[PDB]
Structures are given as structure tokens and as C-alpha cells.
Amino acid sequence: AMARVGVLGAKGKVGATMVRAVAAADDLTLSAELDAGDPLSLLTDGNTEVVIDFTHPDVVMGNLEFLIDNGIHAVVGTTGFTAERFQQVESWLVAKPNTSVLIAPNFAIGAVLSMHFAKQAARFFDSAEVIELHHPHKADAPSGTAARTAKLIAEARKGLPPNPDATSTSLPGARGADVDGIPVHAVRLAGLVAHQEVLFGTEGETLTIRHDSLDRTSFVPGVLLAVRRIAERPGLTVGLEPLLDLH
Amino acid sequence: AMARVGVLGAKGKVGATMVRAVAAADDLTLSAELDAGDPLSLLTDGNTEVVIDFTHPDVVMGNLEFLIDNGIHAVVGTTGFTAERFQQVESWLVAKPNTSVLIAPNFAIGAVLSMHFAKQAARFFDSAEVIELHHPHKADAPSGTAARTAKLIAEARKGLPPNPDATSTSLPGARGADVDGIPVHAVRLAGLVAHQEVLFGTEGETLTIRHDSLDRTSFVPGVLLAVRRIAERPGLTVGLEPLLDLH
Amino acid sequence: AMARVGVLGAKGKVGATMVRAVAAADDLTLSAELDAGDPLSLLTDGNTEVVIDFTHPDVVMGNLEFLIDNGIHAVVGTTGFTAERFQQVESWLVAKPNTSVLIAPNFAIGAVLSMHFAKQAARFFDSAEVIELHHPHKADAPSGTAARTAKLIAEARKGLPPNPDATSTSLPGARGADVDGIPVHAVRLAGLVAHQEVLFGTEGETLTIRHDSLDRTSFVPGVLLAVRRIAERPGLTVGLEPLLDLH
Amino acid sequence: AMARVGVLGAKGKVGATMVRAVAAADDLTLSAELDAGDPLSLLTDGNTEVVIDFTHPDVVMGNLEFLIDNGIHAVVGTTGFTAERFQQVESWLVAKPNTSVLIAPNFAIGAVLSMHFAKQAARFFDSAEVIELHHPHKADAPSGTAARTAKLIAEARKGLPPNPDATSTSLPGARGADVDGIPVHAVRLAGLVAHQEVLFGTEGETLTIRHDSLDRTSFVPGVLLAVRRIAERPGLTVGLEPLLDLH
Ligand SMILES: [Mg+2]
Ligand SMILES: [Mg+2]
Ligand SMILES: [Mg+2]
Ligand SMILES: [Mg+2]
């Protein structure tokens, strides 16, 4: 049987890509392709079982309520998710169990692994730094992922000593951005797409985890994994991490 | 209140380093340093709680027997553990269920983390390769660790297609050593010590884990870790990994 | 004034690309676009001053004679260039001075620099190795460039001791392909395009030069540089290196 | 037949290392080791040909005066060379045209090569950045070498547009220190020594030069090189680079 995948924001960048990806997938059939303004009833009309939603922060809450109200599983890449947005989703889910919602900030599997690996490694090293590298058309430095990683690292190293640093003389910015006591350096280079390197060190050894996103469509295999696996965990899951089944 | 640690093979290379390390540790008390011929009863006379044993394969079994018989936890870095010898350690332990033995081939935390990460990432990528790089005085290519690593990766990827590879024409060796369908390349270069890169790739993303050991004594933190935490797992633990408490 | 660029093999992969590149270039005008079977007279009919030729090894010698006979400068990426082919070109050039021919195996500037840098660095280090990384659809291992680099390195280190190597036990292929005493390792990985790393080492330090070709169209800026600069040196030039004006 | 080398500041850190190195060298004869207060005439009494001087800025000028006056070639690693002091060395040399003085701020061959390569590549790439990585006991960020390097690159790229950079929103420091419009990021990490990456990028290709110093004594080969070759360039040479004979 084809799993019946609906895509919201299907003319949006990510949705159109996902529509294509569902087409190509042997196990998935596209049950409905909706973009801004399409009645959500088209989803139930077509017996959608799971929806990919990468719409705007301003419609996703509309979408989710309808999806949960109707027992349609949701793989959500839309951002703007406050704790007040989150609880609302869990509130909606109370009334409909056996409905799985995934909200994840990042669907590139390599990125999710790296962040996971960084989390696991953090407490074992004296030093941790993040170097992030992106194309020079990038507006924010450091990237969200780098900031997300550094904060993860900081939390993992709670109650450890700070990164050792004997710097007493410096040019401004030499030491990167300080995100919760973790230096984050942002390289902007023509030729690059999205890259991130977490470096850990202790006298005697270092450990580096490097993730390279070479395509704009890196998220694809992860969204697909999320779609395939989403029913395995009822209720709300934040982050793609758990669906990777890491043991 | 501080743990009373003893070291067997204390005049051997690793042994002497560990004595120093334990002397140097603020939370650990050296209760015995033995090497060849020193009666093991020195350990019980001095109220030893945990032992580091990096001694020879030919003496380590008798050490273990005594250690287990006496409720002394053992951190065992000495090699030579056949299936039979593992089985024998297990038997001795049956009689002593509160005693903990950790037998591990690698105490470098970064190398242990790196292998765990390789293992957790292996199934998510079309392609996986190991590059190891050592000083040019190394007899064996590839390193034990790299081989162990490729085996782990192969084992983790069972049921996935082999590494895609269109190679039709090659110079012998270009594609490296085949360890379980996983290419391992051994770089031997002046100026290096011990280094390993694990490269995973899929269309649109790569993930790289690099471990660098800059010291021959990079294993000391792991040994001290094993020594501080060994008692948490009654019985035999194989590999340091379970002690790292990876969630 | 527009420099008048003709492209041979204009429906071929490289030619069509070059036609596009000439169009976009403010200083270049396409004077003639010829592909298999177009009479070369179209070139002189359109007052071509310089031709890009990435045709087949079986027509390039036809093309060159005509180009030199007619004082048309030639930027040649076609392969199959024997010393007997080379001399023929210089023979043809005798009769027409103030006609510049460039035959280069590689027009990616980053690749040409790397090879140059490798040449310069080679004699200063005890060890040199090449690691080449490519997409897994690649037929030859190691790549031509890697083999070309290793041979360059070997020549630069003539009368130096061999790479130190104490290996006495190994799996087959662990140490790479041996190209003139330089190990060449070939990684084939999904996600990769064309990458090459030359590693140099001496006790106390290493030096690595890494080139990444992320596009299929990497050669473009170099072919263009060659086109722009080709008249500066009369007669035959083999390799893009000299036109880079390195001091 | 072997060169007679003397070392000034022979009880200083670098001095003593050089004495050992010269003792150890098969082609070099130690003809004098001096430090504080030893009469410079020891050098001429012992038929010294070349001197290594790594002494203090406050004594190096008097050393040089004597060295030059006596036709003794000088390899000068001591720092503190103002424009005036350079000018004064030049004057002394006028009277002694067969005498050679090499004053260099960096004797690590790999670091000198790397800087030369950066310089030769700079003009060919839209984007250039320096990443340096040191042990976490380093007072100054970025390193002198990295700063020197960025300055070199900037200088080499004059007349090309600045690094493309769309950064509009950033945490202070993310983009690193600006040295002449070239970003330099300083990584401080336990387990490291001295490391520098120069990253060049253009649409479709990147080039990376990485130098790793694994030792505090990685400069010894360069100093021995300078000592064996200094006489080839009469007069003052600044930087080791010209001595490397880069063609
Ligand atoms: Mg389908
Ligand atoms: Mg102690
Ligand atoms: Mg044009
Ligand atoms: Mg000597």
C-alpha cells in the first residue's frame, strides 16, 4: 500500500521539492498537493494520512489544528515554534491520540547526527568550538544551526570548567562569537554552501565532526524518513533526532 | 573517601604513566604499584579498591582471578583476550557479582567516541570510507583502530547496498584496503602521530569524523574515567564505550 | 574592442559551456561557434582571433594546423598530446610566429595552483602523499590529476630519500597506489565531486593543500584567463601554469 | 669542508636547541656556542663562518655589527627589527659586500611555504579567510603568523573587490577579526599546538592551505636551511622565503 502523503505549501520552495520526492518514492503516493489558499478539506477528501508542512509561522497553527482534529500525522518544518505554540499542539493532541506530530528545526540527517554527536562528545573535552562555513550570500552570522549547536554544547558541559583561554591581547572578533561560553566562528566563502565543524580538544587529543551540505535539497531524505516513521511515536516529537533510532 | 587505586605492571610503560596519573589525580589514591613478582596480596594489604592492569597477556589472567576473587574492580588494558579468556572472566565473576571488570582495547575517549559516532551514522549514508594517518614508524597498515572501525561500520550497514563504486580501471591500491566492503586508506607521514577520519557521504551531504591523537598518552583520561566509573557496571564490560554513558 | 573568440566543439559539453561564457564576458565576443563538421573557414570569415578547442584527439591536429596556418591563437583542452603531436605544433608555429598556442591538461585554476604548490613544497618534506576524493561514478582510480600530481612530486624529490615507511604488516591496498614512490589513495564517495589533497610531512610539521571542485564547470575561469592572456606568449605553452603569472 | 657554525644566545631556549641541532647535523661543525658576556672574538678565534643569532633585541645589533665587520654570515631569528635597524644592517653591509645576513620572523618551512602559497593564490579567488588554531595558553589572538598572512593576502588582492559578504545580522565576533579586509578566526583548543588554514573560494572551487606545527621545534629545519644557504644571497635577506628558491 501507498502511504498517503499531503504536502502543504506545495508551490513554496520546500513543498514543491517534497511533492517531487513523494512522486519518486515507491512507497509514497501524493494524496493532496495544497499551497496557500487551498481548502484543507482536500486532505481528508483524498484520505491523506500524513502531511509535510513547511508553510509560514502564521498558518502552521491553523494547519496543525485541522490535521490533529482529523487524525492526520504531521511532519513539520515550519519555524516560529514558541513553548506556547508547542503546548497548544500537545493540547490538541490530547483529544486525538494515535496522531503523531513531528516538529523539527532541521531535516538534514547529517546535520542532526552532527548535533547529536556534538552533544555526546561535549562533556568529555576541555575545549569546544564551532566553525561554521557558508556561501557569502548568507545574512546571519553565526548560522542558526551553529548557534543551536553551541547552546547544545554549553548545556552538555554545564558544571564543567569554561573553555580554557589565556588570551590577554587580541584583535576584536578574533575569538568568534561567544554563544553560552562556546566560541562560534563564521566563515563566508564563495564556493561554499552550508558547512559546520565542531571541534573538541583535550591535551593529547582532538575530535572534529564536520557536516557538509552540498545541495539546497539536503533536508529531503530526512523529511522522507520523518514521513515514513512518524506514526511510530504518537503525540508530539520535537527534533528529528528520536526518529533516527539511535542506540 | 578518595578511591584507592592500584597499578599492576607499574614499571611498564603504561603502568608507570598510570601511577603518575593516579598520583596526580586529586580524587584518587595510589594504594599499590606492582610489577613482576610483587605479591598480589600487596593489593588487599593496602586496601586496594580498583586496579589498572596493563600487564602482559601471560600474567593478566592470574591477576584477574585474584582481583575478582578479592572483590577488586579491574580496568584492563592488557590485550590478548580470546573468547575463552572472556568466558573465563565471566565465570570467575559469577561467584563475585559485585565486582566489575572492564576490558577495553582503546582508552582514548575521542577514539572511542569517534567509533561510536561512525557506528551511529553508518546506516544513513550511501558511502563510507576510513582514512587513517600515522607516523611513518608504524609497522601495521591499516591501524587496529581503523580496521575495528571499518568492521563496526560494515556491521552497522548490513542490509544496505555496498559502497557505490564505478571503478573499472585502477592502479593496485588506489582504493585502499577492503575491510568488510569498507575502504581503509593508511597514510604514513612524518610529523603525524595517530589520526583517523571516517568519511560518510550521500548525494547532497557528507559527514566526517576526525580523531587526532597528538600524544602517546591520550589514553590516560579514559583509563582514569574507567577507574572512576567501573563499579557502576557489575560484571564484565567490554570496551570503554558503555562507561561513557552515551544517551 | 571585443576580442574575437571562436569555439570548436560548440555542442560538446565544454564548448557549449564556453560559448555561454564568451557570451557573458564583456570583453569577449563569439566570432564563430563550430561543432563537428563546420568548415573552419567560418573562423576566418568571422575574423576569429583566438579559438577554444576541446574537441576530440582525432580532430585537434587538423584544427591546430588550420589555426596556426591562419594566425589564430588556440586555447586547447583536448587531450592525447604525444611529444610527436607537440613537436608538430611547434613545427607549424615556426612558419607563423606571433601565434600563441596553449595546450593545458587542466583549466581549473585551483587545481593548477595546487599542483604548482605541491611542486614547490615537495623537496622540503620527508613525506608526501596524495589523497584524491571523487564521486562514486568515477571510472579511474587514482584520477589523472592525482597521478599527474604524484609524478610531479616524485620528480621534485629526485635524489631525496623515499618516503619513510616502516610498514611490515598490512592488508593489500592499505598504503594506496604507488606512483613513482608517492602513495596515492582514491576515495569514492557519494556527495563528493572532485577533490584532491596533497599532504607533506616532516617531524614537527605538516603541510596540506586541498582543492575542491564543487562544480562540473570549474575549468571556465581558467579557459577564459587562457583566452584573455594567450597572446602574451608567442609559440607553444604547455600547461596553464605560466599564464597565471606566478612570481 | 663542513660549515663552521656558531650559535649566539646558546643557553637561551632556541640557542641551545640550535647547538644540539648543529651538533647533530652531519654537514655542520659547531665552532662556537656563546651566550651573555662571552666575547664575540670567540667566533673569529674559532674560525666561525655562519652564526645563528636568536638573542635578545637589545644585544642583536652589536652582534650584527661585529658579525658583519668580520665577514661572518648571520641567521637572525631574534626579533625587534625596526625600519631603522634594517637600514643600519644595510649600511654595515655596504662595507662588507660578500657578507650575508638573513633576518626572518619565521623559520618553519611549512609556515613559510604556506604563506607564499596564500600570496600566490590570493588574486585568483573571490573569497579569502584565515583560520588559525592554537593551544589555549596563547596570549595573542590572532597569531602573528595569521595576521602576517592576512596582510600578505590582502596586499596580493589589491584591486580586486573585497570578500563578498551579505552578513547583515551577527553576534559580535562571528565574522572574526578584520586584518586588511581579510577575516582571521582564532581557535583556542586544548590538544592543539599551532595550526593555520588559509581558505580561498570562488563559485565552483575552493582551495585550502593548512599548516600544522606539532612541535615547538619545527623551525629547526628552516634555521639549518638558512644556515646552509645563507651565503648564496650577499647582503640582507628578509624572510626565509627567498632562500627556499621558489621557481
Ligand atoms: Mg510516489
Ligand atoms: Mg592522587
Ligand atoms: Mg560576450
Ligand atoms: Mg654537526
Side-chain angles (χ1 to χ4, degrees), chain B residues 41-137:
Chain B
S41 68
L42 287 179
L43 294 176
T44 51
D45 297 349
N47 286 141
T48 297
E49 298 171 356
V50 193
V51 146
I52 306 171
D53 184 333
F54 267 84
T55 67
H56 188 92
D58 304 348
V59 356
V60 61
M61 288 308 277
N63 292 342
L64 277 174
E65 197 177 2
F66 172 93
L67 287 178
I68 293 162
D69 190 50
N70 286 277
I72 315 179
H73 311 304
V75 174
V76 183
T78 142
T79 62
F81 282 99
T82 62
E84 193 203 288
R85 288 189 164 181
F86 280 128
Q87 306 177 352
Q88 172 72 92
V89 168
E90 296 275 27
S91 299
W92 290 332
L93 284 158
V94 168
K96 293 280 167 185
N98 301 140
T99 306
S100 294
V101 173
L102 170 83
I103 295 163
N106 204 327
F107 284 92
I109 293 169
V112 172
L113 286 174
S114 136
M115 282 189 273
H116 174 76
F117 300 157
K119 178 172 55 206
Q120 281 197 335
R123 82 183 151 211
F124 298 102
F125 294 90
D126 298 343
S127 261
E129 300 215 8
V130 177
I131 306 184
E132 57 98 331
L133 320 97
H134 288 76
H135 61 84
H137 310 285

Side-chain angles (χ1 to χ4, degrees), chain B residues 22-23 25 28:
Chain B
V22 171
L28 296 180

Side-chain angles (χ1 to χ4, degrees), chain D residues 2-3 19-30 228:
Chain D
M2 303 317 169
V19 159
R20 282 188 258 112
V22 171
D26 277 299
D27 59 316
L28 296 180
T29 305
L30 188 50
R228 300 165 165 130

Side-chain angles (χ1 to χ4, degrees), chain B residues 199-222:
Chain B
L199 302 195
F200 295 110
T202 197
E203 179 190 63
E205 89 182 325
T206 68
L207 183 73
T208 294
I209 295 134
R210 196 184 161 137
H211 177 236
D212 300 297
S213 182
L214 299 105
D215 266 325
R216 290 278 228 85
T217 68
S218 63
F219 69 76
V220 162

Side-chain angles (χ1 to χ4, degrees), chain A residues 2 22-26 28-29:
Chain A
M2 251 65 146
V22 163
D26 274 351
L28 313 173
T29 192

Side-chain angles (χ1 to χ4, degrees), chain A residues 106-118 130-134 143 145-146 148-149 192-199 208-221, chain B residues 121 124-125 198-210, chain C residues 192:
Chain A
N106 204 322
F107 287 87
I109 295 166
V112 174
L113 284 172
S114 299
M115 288 190 275
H116 175 70
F117 296 165
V130 181
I131 299 165
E132 163 266 286
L133 327 200
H134 281 77
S143 64
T145 302
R148 160 163 68 260
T149 309
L192 295 195
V193 184
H195 316 264
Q196 187 187 285
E197 212 162 17
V198 189
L199 330 198
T208 309
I209 296 133
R210 182 171 169 151
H211 172 246
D212 297 297
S213 166
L214 315 140
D215 248 306
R216 274 30 144 96
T217 66
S218 56
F219 60 81
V220 162
Chain B
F124 298 102
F125 294 90
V198 183
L199 302 195
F200 295 110
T202 197
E203 179 190 63
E205 89 182 325
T206 68
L207 183 73
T208 294
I209 295 134
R210 196 184 161 137
Chain C
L192 295 195

Side-chain angles (χ1 to χ4, degrees), chain A residues 30-184:
Chain A
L30 182 92
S31 64
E33 163 166 31
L34 314 208
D35 194 321
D38 278 314
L40 295 176
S41 76
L42 283 173
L43 298 164
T44 49
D45 286 343
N47 301 319
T48 307
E49 301 162 338
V50 60
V51 162
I52 298 174
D53 180 329
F54 280 72
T55 57
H56 201 261
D58 279 332
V59 289
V60 73
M61 292 305 291
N63 294 344
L64 278 176
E65 190 187 13
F66 174 99
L67 294 158
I68 302 158
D69 182 39
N70 284 276
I72 304 162
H73 306 309
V75 163
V76 185
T78 316
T79 58
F81 273 106
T82 57
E84 328 196 292
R85 294 283 194 85
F86 267 8
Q87 189 54 245
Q88 185 69 108
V89 172
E90 296 254 51
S91 303
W92 286 334
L93 288 162
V94 157
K96 321 273 162 156
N98 295 133
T99 296
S100 302
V101 165
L102 174 78
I103 303 162
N106 204 322
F107 287 87
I109 295 166
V112 174
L113 284 172
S114 299
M115 288 190 275
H116 175 70
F117 296 165
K119 257 189 72 156
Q120 289 202 316
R123 75 176 140 119
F124 295 102
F125 297 85
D126 282 341
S127 300
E129 296 204 15
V130 181
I131 299 165
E132 163 266 286
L133 327 200
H134 281 77
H135 67 269
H137 307 263
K138 175 164 183 67
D140 55 313
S143 64
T145 302
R148 160 163 68 260
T149 309
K151 300 180 206 146
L152 286 162
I153 291 175
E155 173 67 22
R157 313 172 76 220
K158 237 193 170 198
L160 305 189
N163 279 16
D165 193 14
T167 299
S168 40
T169 181
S170 57
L171 302 158
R175 298 279 299 120
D178 177 308
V179 188
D180 295 346
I182 307 307
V184 186

